[PDB]
Amino acid sequence: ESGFDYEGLIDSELQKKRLDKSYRYFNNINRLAKEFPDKVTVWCSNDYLALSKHPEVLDAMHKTIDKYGCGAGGTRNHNIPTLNLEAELATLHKKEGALVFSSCYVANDAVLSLLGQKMKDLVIFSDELNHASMIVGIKHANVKKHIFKHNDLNELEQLLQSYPKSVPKLIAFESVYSMAGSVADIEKICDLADKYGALTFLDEVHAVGLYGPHGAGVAEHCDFESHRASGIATPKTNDKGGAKTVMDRVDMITGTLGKSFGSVGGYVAASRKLIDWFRSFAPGFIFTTTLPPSVMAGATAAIRYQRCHIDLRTSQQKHTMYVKKAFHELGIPVIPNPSHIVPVLIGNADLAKQASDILINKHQIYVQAINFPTVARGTERLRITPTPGHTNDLSDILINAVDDVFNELQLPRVRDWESQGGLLGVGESGFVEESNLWTSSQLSLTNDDLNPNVRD
Amino acid sequence: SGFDYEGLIDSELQKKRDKVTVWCSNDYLALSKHPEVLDAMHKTIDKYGCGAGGTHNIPTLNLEAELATLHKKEGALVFSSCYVANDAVLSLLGQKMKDLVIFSDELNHASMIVGIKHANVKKHIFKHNDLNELEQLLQSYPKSVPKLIAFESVYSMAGSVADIEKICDLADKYGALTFLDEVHAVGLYGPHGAGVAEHCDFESHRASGIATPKTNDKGGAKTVMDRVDMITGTLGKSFGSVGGYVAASRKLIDWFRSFAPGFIFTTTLPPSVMAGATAAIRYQRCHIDLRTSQQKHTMYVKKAFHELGIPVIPNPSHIVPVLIGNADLAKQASDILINKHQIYVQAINFPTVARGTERLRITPTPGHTNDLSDILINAVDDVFNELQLPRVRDWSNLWTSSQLSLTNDDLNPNVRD
Numbered sequence: 021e022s023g024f025d026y027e028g029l030i031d032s033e034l035q036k037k038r039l040d041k042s043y044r045y046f047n048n049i050n051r052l053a054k055e056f057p058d059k060v061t062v063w064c065s066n067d068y069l070a071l072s073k074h075p076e077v078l079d080a081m082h083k084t085i086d087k088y089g090c091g092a093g094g095t096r097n098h099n100i101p102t103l104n105l106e107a108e109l110a111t112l113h114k115k116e117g118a119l120v121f122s123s124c125y126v127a128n129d130a131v132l133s134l135l136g137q138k139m140k141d142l143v144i145f146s147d148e149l150n151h152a153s154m155i156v157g158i159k160h161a162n163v164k165k166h167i168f169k170h171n172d173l174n175e176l177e178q179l180l181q182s183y184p185k186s187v188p189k190l191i192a193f194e195s196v197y198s199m200a201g202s203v204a205d206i207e208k209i210c211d212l213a214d215k216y217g218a219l220t221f222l223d224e225v226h227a228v229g230l231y232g233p234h235g236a237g238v239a240e241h242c243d244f245e246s247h248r249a250s251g252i253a254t255p256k257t258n259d260k261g262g263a264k265t266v267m268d269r270v271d272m273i274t275g276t277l278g279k280s281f282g283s284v285g286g287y288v289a290a291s292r293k294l295i296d297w298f299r300s301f302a303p304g305f306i307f308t309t310t311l312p313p314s315v316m317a318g319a320t321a322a323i324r325y326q327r328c329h330i331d332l333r334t335s336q337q338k339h340t341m342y343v344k345k346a347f348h349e350l351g352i353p354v355i356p357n358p359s360h361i362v363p364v365l366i367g368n369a370d371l372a373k374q375a376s377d378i379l380i381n382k383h384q385i386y387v388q389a390i391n392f393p394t395v396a397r398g399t400e401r402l403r404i405t406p407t408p409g410h411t412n413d414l415s416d417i418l419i420n421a422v423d424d425v426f427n428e429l430q431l432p433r434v435r436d437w438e439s440q441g442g443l444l445g446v447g448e449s450g451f452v453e454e455s456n457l458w459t460s461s462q463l464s465l466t467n468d469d470l471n472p473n474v475r476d
Numbered sequence: 477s478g479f480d481y482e483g484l485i486d487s488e489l490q491k492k493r494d495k496v497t498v499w500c501s502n503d504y505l506a507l508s509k510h511p512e513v514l515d516a517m518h519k520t521i522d523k524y525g526c527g528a529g530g531t532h533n534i535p536t537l538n539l540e541a542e543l544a545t546l547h548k549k550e551g552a553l554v555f556s557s558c559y560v561a562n563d564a565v566l567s568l569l570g571q572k573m574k575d576l577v578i579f580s581d582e583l584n585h586a587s588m589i590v591g592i593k594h595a596n597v598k599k600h601i602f603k604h605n606d607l608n609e610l611e612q613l614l615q616s617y618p619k620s621v622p623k624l625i626a627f628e629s630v631y632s633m634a635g636s637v638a639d640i641e642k643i644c645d646l647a648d649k650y651g652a653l654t655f656l657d658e659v660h661a662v663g664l665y666g667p668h669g670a671g672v673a674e675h676c677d678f679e680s681h682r683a684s685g686i687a688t689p690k691t692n693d694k695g696g697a698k699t700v701m702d703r704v705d706m707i708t709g710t711l712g713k714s715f716g717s718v719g720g721y722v723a724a725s726r727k728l729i730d731w732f733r734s735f736a737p738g739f740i741f742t743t744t745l746p747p748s749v750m751a752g753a754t755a756a757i758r759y760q761r762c763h764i765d766l767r768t769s770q771q772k773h774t775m776y777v778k779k780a781f782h783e784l785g786i787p788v789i790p791n792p793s794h795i796v797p798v799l800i801g802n803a804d805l806a807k808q809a810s811d812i813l814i815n816k817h818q819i820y821v822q823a824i825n826f827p828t829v830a831r832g833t834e835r836l837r838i839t840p841t842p843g844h845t846n847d848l849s850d851i852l853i854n855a856v857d858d859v860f861n862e863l864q865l866p867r868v869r870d871w872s873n874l875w876t877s878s879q880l881s882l883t884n885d886d887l888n889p890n891v892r893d
């Protein structure tokens with residue numbers, strides 16, 4: 021008998037994927053190689069505050085390179101850029117400590133894996149729409165998992181209450197869910213954690229930079245006024261007069277440096293004891309090269325800047341609300357959500373892909389078509405993420421273009437969805453939309469309304 | 477009432493509870509501070525900014541192309557880190573071949589161990605470099621059972637080197653894929669720094685430059701580097717940046733790209749970091765003087781230590797592990813080296829190495845000229861005498877002198893294409 025047909029397996033797997041060809045034989049190298057390869061407004065981006073191109077960030081990078089070079093390997097003095105970045109992140113989340121990883125994928129995986137490796141009897145309660153990095157972390161934990169329906173805290177409580185209090189538990193969830201912009205009720209989950217003796221693990225990847233007075237995320241937003249008053253200080257009380265804020269109550273908060281903060285990397289912020297434990301025992305931390313000083317300095321600059329520029333957030337939120345209100349009046353079906361994301365429901369993969377195909381070619385607008393398996397078949401959509409940079413004149417070009425594409429491809433509008441009973445809140449007979457996280461009051465704040473200590 | 481999380485953590489934690497010459501470093505060729513690298517960074521930032529979020533991109537294609545060229549593979553894929561590359565590739569091979577058996581060298585890096593565990597398939601550990609044991613394990617399965625042999629070219633703590641050609645021979649006979657981590661060899665072995673696999677056909681590769689040669693050093697059809705199915709490396713050590721990669725056939729690369737979540741669900745590395753790595757790889761490929769100089773410095777330090785009876789763990793690589801055999805004395809030795817001689821050397825203890833085999837790790841670079849080496853030899857000799865450490869009595873190189881006499885103009889001009 022001959023060997024396993026490795027090539028046959030790969031070929032059959034690949035034949036299912038839509039991969040056209042870029043590799044060709046080159047006489048000069050006597051082998052195959054990959055053959056090498058405009059003015060477009062980007063309306064879908066993870067660079068939510070446009071900080072990746074901000075002067076303070078680029079300046080911090082250039083200057084750090086002058087001092088330190090490229091990689092961490094060329095430095096001996098943790099190094100100072102690491103301490104600076106960890107301190108900034110701990111400050112942002114008002115935690116005792118923080119730890120930086122290669123990516124938030126690795127952060128999620130390393131933390132969740134370690135909790136399950138050290139507590140074999142841990143039970144994880146996981147929101148059904150958690151990011152793949154959390155799913156993989158929970159899998160790598162090799163502990164029991166119960167999935168609760170998205171944001172269904174009735175179902176979460178039933179699952180939690182079925183166990184004795186003394187059983188170790190973790191509730192794992194995101195603050196903002198990127199594909200529809202839904203938002204967890206963090207305070208209620210913290211309440212449940214207290215009652216049923218659970219740790220909380222919160223992924224604020226799609227909130228950091230964007231929520232709370234200082235961009236510390238939805239957890240900060242839950243005690244908006246306490247945090248605004250205290251600045252970088254731990255407030256004496258929370259918004260309802262109690263001792264501990266929501267962000268204080270969450271055990272573990274993970275984020276990225278790769279989105280709002282205009283760089284790359286991930287982190288967890290937590291108690292000194294949790295951070296020391298991760299640092300001591302997590303192989304995905306221990307056994308990998310530190311991020312380059314320049315990248316860490318850039319992230320640090322972005323965090324410091326965004327903390328004291330609430331006008332970044334108020335600007336993003338106003339642009340979002342401008343786009344949403346316009347779409348509402350035109351009957352363009354946005355999945356209702358209280359966040360910064362504008363998901364336009366199409367409900368057809370071919371038509372969703374064809375819409376962003378026309379947006380790009382005919383209107384020079386980039387918008388991402390989202391299909392299965394990212395979302396459910398039937399719920400396909402265009403994802404739009406307004407930024408501080410999307411002024412009303414750019415928004416006006418986006419609204420006209422999208423309206424034009426809806427008419428060109430004859431896509432369903434809000435009232436069409438209604439006649440089918442609705443979908444994901446769109447044209448749903450008597451749906452009670454959540455209020456926007458950002459109130460009118462909060463949106464009228466300026467940088468002068470921040471505590472002066474946010475610059476020192 | 478509730479579970480004592482804090483009590484568990486405390487218990488776990490309690491169970492573990494200036495101008496200095498750096499002589500231990502993963503920045504083997506000092507390229508993290510090389511002007512071409514810094515220039516490529518500064519220029520890329522001006523064009524692209526900081527993170528990839530604000531921008532495949534051209535920097536990614538350029539970097540992947542360079543790495544494919546380095547290893548003379550059809551393609552390459554860049555990940556966050558070599559840790560992630562190793563984990564993602566090993567995991568996917570196990571997930572897609574349900575009857576896969578992985579055969580793993582006992583001293584493989586933690587990232588490979590975790591990748592293998594995530595693959596969740598049958599696993600056999602063979603004693604370090606023991607190819608008799610490897611063969612016995614391979615022959616105990618039918619040929620038609622899919623297999624993977626996972627190993628490193630150079631092992632960082634003692635500088636031992638895999639017999640890559642013989643493992644490829646075994647792979648052929650027993651129907652196995654080979655997965656090779658060249659993290660501690662890229663930059664440092666072969667005419668172009670492509671690693672130990674390249675070095676196995678040094679003359680064929682030197683002659684052909686960036687081209688695939690039609691014969692190998694012993695007259696056969698396929699070079700060692702060509703026979704290895706998957707090669708992983710880092711951008712974070714020799715190449716003076718951050719990131720990892722695998723280089724392999726187009727079909728393997730397309731498959732990894734299509735199916736690996738630890739690729740798909742992470743932010744692309746910053747363009748500047750990729751540009752820097754690219755410049756470092758391009759530079760080092762056409763500067764064999766980097767390697768010949770590193771190797772000469774190493775051999776200079778080793779020969780001196782040999783005549784002084786300072787116990788270097790014998791190895792054919794660039795690493796100088798000085799055996800101490802006591803954790804307290806090993807830590808105290810590098811403590812005196814730093815305070816009294818302004819020399820930095822890393823003490824290596826359990827669990828990195830076996831209890832009893834504690835050592836100082838020394839990694840000579842192109843920058844360590846003989847005058848600096850002379851300061852290192854005197855200082856180490858002084859510390860051995862101060863702490864009364866055991867010497868040799870108490871207890872060949874991959875680079876030939878032929879290879880060491882090559883200069884940059886002995887390379888094919890096509891290496892600057």
Ligand SMILES: Cc1ncc(COP(=O)(O)O)c(C=O)c1O
Nearest residue numbers: 123124125151225276278742743
């Ligand atoms: C919700 C969520 N969590 C975690 C991550 C991982 O972040 P990073 O890209 O820094 O690895 C992402 C990234 O897309 C994410 O969207």
Ligand SMILES: *Cc1c(COP(=O)(O)O)cnc(C)c1O
Nearest residue numbers: 308309557558559585659710712
């Ligand atoms: C350092 C190391 C790596 C890890 O690579 P990073 O890119 O630093 O994650 C992997 N393999 C080996 C053998 C190493 O020594």
